[PDB]
Write a protein that binds this ligand. Sequence first.
Ligand code: 7SE
Ligand code: ZN
Length: 105
Amino acid sequence: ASIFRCRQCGQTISRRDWLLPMGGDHEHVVFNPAGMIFRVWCFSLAQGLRLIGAPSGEFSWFKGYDWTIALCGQCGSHLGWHYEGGSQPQTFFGLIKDRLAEGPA
Ligand SMILES: O=C1CC[C@H](n2nc3ccccc3n2)C(=O)N1
Ligand SMILES: [Zn+2]
């Protein structure tokens, strides 16, 4: 269990090696304004996504970061968000853990 794929279609998304401890933890449990709870895992890098729209700062769970919706580039499943416009690091991915499948390289 080293690679993360899209749970719906099996698109290659990220690696356990690429987990990023933002504020001391890679896992952040967050709620959106619609009251949906997400278990978000922070990654330095991801692939196989499609980033939709222009960045927005509204309701950002990570101070100083603007977000873009990250879909699976293959099946269009909402996998999380790309974050940018911040510092150390400038950019990262917040992916919804339960929408990924972990398995061998
Ligand atoms: O960091 C983030 C990413 C985006 C996320 N968010 N989900 C929404 C659903 C409906 C309307 C606005 C919304 N904002 C959020 O709350 N925070
Ligand atoms: Zn997919």
